[PDB]
Design a protein around this ligand. Structure first.
Ligand SMILES: CC(C)=CCC/C(C)=C/CC/C(C)=C/COP(=O)(O)OP(=O)(O)O
Ligand SMILES: CC(C)=CCC/C(C)=C/CC/C(C)=C/COP(=O)(O)OP(=O)(O)O
Ligand SMILES: [Mg+2]
Ligand SMILES: [Mg+2]
Ligand SMILES: [Mg+2]
Ligand SMILES: [Mg+2]
Lengths: 299, 304
């Protein structure tokens, strides 16, 4: 009976959870803690009170930092922001759980943006839709990389995955803001910005290695990722009939090598053989021009 | 310059592109575990006898539960480095850890979208999202504490109480989630059945822990390989500690820390549990006491 009593108290109450415990499972997340400027610039247009902007901001940082914990497991990364990745320190298991834990903490902050039922309903739908999109882009990015060469994505395919994957968070922040704006839509512009952002990340990952084997590590090659330059090189070589080059590119990616000279041979293949690096640079300026060269404010 | 801008223009002005083919690719890890219910759907069907939801609504709740459950297994298996799930090879060993994690997470939000099709009644919908959000936070708290104890062993040796609060959260979360949504949707229903569903969740987990050691002794006893702080183990470790049985307490710990697949060694542990601590007999008596609170609930305190 003393057991059955202690048990009756257990089941007739909320599940117990201390802050000691909160601390123990937040380890992976706190470690990565060791944007915004953008949210501020856009708010000049949305005019959200500071209190509400703060929450939108905490929400995005929670989803973002969490994404990195996961992406680093998925991409098998050893370094983020210059430190060892959380999963290498605390393990893949805790990191997955903590990161997924944070997704829901973020969802939980949404009920603090409003007390109005209809408005709340739209913030949840937005949250849910963009998260579904983020996983869709990420899903494809991982599939192409891991089942290569089952699928050699074209430039258009890569661009759509980028819309979902990177455009996803950009759109979630904006759409939340537009829905809260007490005050055309900026989504298209934010979509373009996300694309510019992802192709630039892809680009610099290799450029900061071709210039200094101590500026970047061209980790993307190690991961075997189908970056923008890589997608350009694989299609270019197939189209120009460069079978050997096409195949050597695949081989190097499939190796998942940390060899600096092998990574540098691939970067130079993109440099002189396929001109993927020039192509990517020029593609980035063109995308930026669409913006800088918009006097009619269509963006 | 000009045709490339035309295409980028079309691209950024449209919703993100997604095909049915892409959906198949992203679902492979999921559809793979589907080849594994009429016992999860059974309890839902019986409980509806008390909640009386319109069938199609009941189907949605149902679909939501298959998604969360199945996706949780995809992740638990990665998290527990399990080679087998219900007989076949786990998805992460076939499709890889990356796709598996992502596909399971993708399903979490798919399940969340289903929730907003259970009703459009603004008030009610908020209670459904709160419930969903609340139980997923709890499930993750339980899961995180179970993983922590296992991966940090022997830093913290949980007590029985501790193991039970962890269970309320972990396993009880999906049970409560289902129940609470059903109850909030109910058109009818007496006292809340959460307490009963909580007790049901505890029985289920401990039963799971017990059977995993007992099906081996009679089941590969994977829980030993994983180094999991199960109910019998939590009992063996505290019992031995309390009896100042130093060398057995340590031998238990050495074996769990071996993360071994050696049947001889897994057996050496099961025997410490039978002959030294009697943890298996003790776990058995515990499940029985828990079930008796149900079989002897003439007052209908927990039962409907
Ligand atoms: C926002 C959110 C909750 C997302 C959940 C799904 C998820 C893990 C998305 C990945 C987000 C992302 C763009 C990571 C970095 O991309 P990358 O692969 O190029 O990695 P890098 O930043 O190191 O270049
Ligand atoms: C419901 C949901 C969305 C969950 C997501 C988070 C997650 C990984 C939950 C696992 C829940 C659970 C009790 C799994 C099995 O327990 P176990 O560790 O004893 O493993 P086993 O049941 O295979 O023996
Ligand atoms: Mg990455
Ligand atoms: Mg990535
Ligand atoms: Mg498990
Ligand atoms: Mg587990």
């Amino acid at each position: 009976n003393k057991m059955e009593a202690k048990i009756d108290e257990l089941i007739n109450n909320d599940p117990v959870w201390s802050s000691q415990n909160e601390s123990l499972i937040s380890k992976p997340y706190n470690h990565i803690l060791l944007r915004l400027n953008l949210i501020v610039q856009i708010n000049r247009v949305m005019n959200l009170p500071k209190d509400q902007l703060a929450i939108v901001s905490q929400i995005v940082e929670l989803l973002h930092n969490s994404s990195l914990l996961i992406d680093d497991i998925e991409d098998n990364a050893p370094l983020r922001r210059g430190q060892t990745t959380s999963h290498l320190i605390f393990g893949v298991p805790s990191t997955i759980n903590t990161a997924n834990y944070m997704y829901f903490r973020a969802m939980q902050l949404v009920s603090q943006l409003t007390t109005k039922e209809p408005l709340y309903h739209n913030l949840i739908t937005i949250f849910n839709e963009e998260l579904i999109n983020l996983h869709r882009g990420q899903g494809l990015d991982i599939y192409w990389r891991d089942f290569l060469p089952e699928i050699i994505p074209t430039q258009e395919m890569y661009l759509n995955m980028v819309m979902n994957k990177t455009g996803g968070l950009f759109r979630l922040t904006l759409r939340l803001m537009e829905a809260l704006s007490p005050s055309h839509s900026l989504v298209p512009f934010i979509n373009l910005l996300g694309i510019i952002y992802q192709i630039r990340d892809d680009y610099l990952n290799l450029k900061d290695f071709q210039m200094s084997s101590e500026k970047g590590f061209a980790e993307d090659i190690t991961e075997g990722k189908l970056s923008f330059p890589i997608v350009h090189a694989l299609n270019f070589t197939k189209t120009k009939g460069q079978t050997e080059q096409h195949n050597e590119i695949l081989r190097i990616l499939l190796l998942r090598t940390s060899d600096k000279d092998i990574k540098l041979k691939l970067i130079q293949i993109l440099e002189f053989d396929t001109n993927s690096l020039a192509y990517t640079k020029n593609f980035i300026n063109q995308l930026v021009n669409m913006i800088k060269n918009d006097n009619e404010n269509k963006y």
